[PDB]
Design a protein around this ligand. Structure first.
Ligand SMILES: Nc1ncnc2c1ncn2[C@@H]1O[C@H](CSCC[C@H](N)C(=O)O)[C@@H](O)[C@H]1O
Ligand SMILES: Nc1ncnc2c1ncn2[C@@H]1O[C@H](CSCC[C@H](N)C(=O)O)[C@@H](O)[C@H]1O
Lengths: 186, 272, 267, 186
């Protein structure tokens, strides 16, 4: 439970994005105006790196889009994420609010899912997107579990992905509760 | 006032046949608690019988949680050797560090992190993790990058009648210092066989390893226990098969090397 | 000053004879055993580091061999019981199958016992299943020229082994006695973490929420042998089981040999 | 080797016959004129019995004739024979000539024969009888091996017995060498 913060004492948020950047979609909410550091391949990224990159309030990372845009077994993202996520944590005397989020673009098996959940300490929260003619998330950002839709099935979801191999807007509104902790711009 | 040395509380993951505890007792170090994560009933039994219950057997690694860790009391020593299979350059079918049993490694990592003292607490904390030397360069790296350290190759060849080159990651004191033979340390494979049998090689690694009274034969289990440095008849529990037993000793820790490795703990904990 | 014992073991099995001989602290000049089973043969070899001179099949031993094998002070033996067991319907009795083997013991006993005139001390013993045909028990008694002495290891061990004993060993009748060290309770034989159902063996153990069969380690311990006494070949369990299965109860045998300390070299 | 004895020092022979007596055929050679003790079933015969039955110089025993005249596994005769044979032995200081003989009427298997020979310490001596229209022996009676006929085959001999189930004179001449040790009558 994170204790809310008054408006006249909320500074710009420092975001660390891994495997994908939110520099754009995060600005669209008035969180930016850089304060966000982006990194693609973390392979050799050491602890001191994640520290000298200035303190962070939000650690974000997400699996590559469905298509295999890059070569590197699924889990990798999760494991690596957990790695730097830890290097990014604050000190014991929790200075200010610290948040993290890992998003999966329907790319992790049901095996890799148990790992991910058990590793990030919580079941994901699947949020769909319907249109008729046209993603899983882990995080500690407030009321992210009361927004879960225990509707969409797995079987269908599997069908969704299997069909995408043979051929944003979602999470963008998950950052809103963060408006209550950091500075909003214009 | 007085800050006395206290007994060691250990957490062994992929405990196997409790070489960890075996050696800990060997060095004469008092053990407050020895919590092991083992899933193989055969090895589980061995530990159970050989150390008369003392070992608190938790279950599968990935059923252990941060909640469990701090609840299982704070730990002084964390040791482990995740399954080598999917990392072995020899096993073509190997699924690497990220798939198969290869994954099990991060389980060790995750738990290591959940147990190591948080920034601020200066409490003494030691950990150790082993694995086959013959692994993919990428894996060796990633592991190093995860545990945030580089290993220390060390072959039991130098202190036992066998060739076991393994990598060692950890913060135990003096892990690099050269090993040493002991007045008691069968280094010649001949010095391991039972009476009436003759050895071909000086060290096992080249087929049947020993000849006997005019017949060519394979290594006996008593002898193999004797080759890794386990007490004789140490794995004579249950009614498991020769093949089973073998698999036990087969993938265990060379007692002489863990003695070597653990040795400098004696100065940091209560002693029996 | 008495001298070391010279023994001839027929159907030696896993050297229980020599084991106990040593236990009583009796010097052994030689221990010649007639064994055909390789598994048992190895056990003896390793366990007594060669000391046992292994002859071959009993009926390949001849009078010539006996006095040539040096004179014998002790002759012991327990011919296969299968073809004598009332339980085994297929049994071919004392005259066929393995039953015959008995006479081999008789033949050799005869060829070794001191000839009329020689007063030299000579001791012999022969065992076999109590559960045998009245005619066979007779014939045997008539051949060895004496009557058995039934004795069950139940009185000195966690098991029920009623066996007949023919022999001239001193005090074979006197009642047995338990020792400060003598697991009589089947529970005191089991390995840590297992519970016993019965008090004596005839799914025996109760292990951590599981019903299971005795362990070879506890079985040796049931029989009065030292733990790990049969952990030698890469010998399977069934094999290892079979070995012990057909042996003598060490306590029962320490008993019978005990008085023998009084005639030979006290190691 | 039994040392030959002079005529005026040859008393009548005492014969112990088991499973069959030679009281008749032994007389026909002038060895008798009783001095011979016959016993059929020796099951309960103890050592003392064989002793009080007066000293013996000749122990004879033989398998029952081809037909199963009696019920008792073949070996029995051999084993039992070896038993009493020993009870009848003299003392260490060999007083006089001691002889024994065990005859088999083609009733012992080739197994039972290895036992028999190995038990009586010597191969048998097969003595046939031909006629055109119509026995193995063990013993220590001198020159009994130079009278061996290494001719007759086993396979034939086996056929001889197998055909007798589906439907003396021999050994009588083996006692002759005894004439040189004991008293002859008329
Ligand atoms: N999910 C899991 N959790 C806990 N142990 C596991 C496991 N999967 C496999 N294992 C255990 O992995 C071990 C690897 S062998 C390690 C042996 C050990 N160093 C010794 O000295 O005995 C095996 O003993 C096996 O039972
Ligand atoms: N022809 C033969 N010659 C020698 N040993 C024989 C034999 N036939 C059977 N045996 C042996 O008979 C033994 C009988 S079991 C006797 C057990 C033994 N007294 C003990 O204390 O262990 C067996 O181990 C078997 O191998």
């Amino acid at each position: 439970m994170f204790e809310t913060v008054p408006v006249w004492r909320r500074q710009p948020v420092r975001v660390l994005s891994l495997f994908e950047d939110i520099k754009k979609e995060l600005t669209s909410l008035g969180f930016l105006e850089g304060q966000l550091k982006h990194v693609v391949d973390v392979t050799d990224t050491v602890r001191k790196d994640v520290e000298e990159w200035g303190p962070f309030d939000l650690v974000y990372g997400a699996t590559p889009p469905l298509g295999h845009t890059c070569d590197r077994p699924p889990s990798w993202y999760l494991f690596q994420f957990h790695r730097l996520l830890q290097y990014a944590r604050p000190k014991p005397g929790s200075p200010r609010p610290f948040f993290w989020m890992f998003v999966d673009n329907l790319v992790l098996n049901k095996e890799d899912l148990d790992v991910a959940s058990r590793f990030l300490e919580m079941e994901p929260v699947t949020i769909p997107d319907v249109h008729g003619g046209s993603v899983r998330v882990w995080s500690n950002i407030p009321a992210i579990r009361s927004r879960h839709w225990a509707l969409v099935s797995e079987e269908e979801l599997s069908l969704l992905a299997q069909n995408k191999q043979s051929s944003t807007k979602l999470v963008k509104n998950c950052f809103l509760p963060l408006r209550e902790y950091f500075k909003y711009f214009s | 006032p007085a800050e006395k040395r206290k007994p060691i509380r250990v957490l062994s993951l992929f405990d196997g046949i409790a070489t960890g505890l075996l050696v800990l007792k060997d060095l004469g170090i008092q053990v407050d608690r020895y919590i092991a994560s083992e899933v193989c009933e055969d090895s589980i039994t061995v530990g159970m019988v050989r150390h008369q219950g003392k070992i608190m057997y938790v279950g599968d690694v990935r059923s252990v949680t941060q909640k469990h860790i701090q609840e299982w009391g704070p730990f002084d020593l964390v040791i482990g050797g995740s399954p080598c299979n999917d990392l072995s350059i020899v096993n073509p079918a190997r699924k690497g560090l990220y798939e198969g049993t290869g994954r099990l490694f991060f389980e060790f990592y995750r738990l290591l992190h959940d147990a190591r003292p948080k920034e601020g607490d200066d409490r003494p904390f030691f950990w150790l993790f082993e694995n086959v030397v013959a692994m993919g360069v990428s894996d060796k790296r990633d592991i190093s990058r995860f545990l945030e350290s580089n290993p220390v190759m060390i072959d039991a060849k130098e202190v036992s009648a066998a060739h076991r080159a393994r990598y060692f990651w950890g913060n135990l004191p003096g892990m690099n210092r050269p090993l040493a033979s002991t007045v008691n340390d069968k280094l010649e494979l001949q010095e391991c066989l039972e009476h009436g049998r003759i050895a071909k090689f000086s060290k096992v690694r080249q087929h049947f390893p020993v000849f006997m009274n005019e017949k060519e034969d394979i290594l006996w289990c008593t002898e193999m226990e004797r080759v890794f440095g386990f007490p004789v008849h140490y794995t004579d529990v249950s009614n498991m098969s020769r093949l089973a037993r073998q698999r036990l000793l087969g993938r265990s820790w060379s007692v002489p090397v863990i003695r070597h490795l653990f040795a400098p703990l004696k100065e940091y904990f209560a002693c029996v």
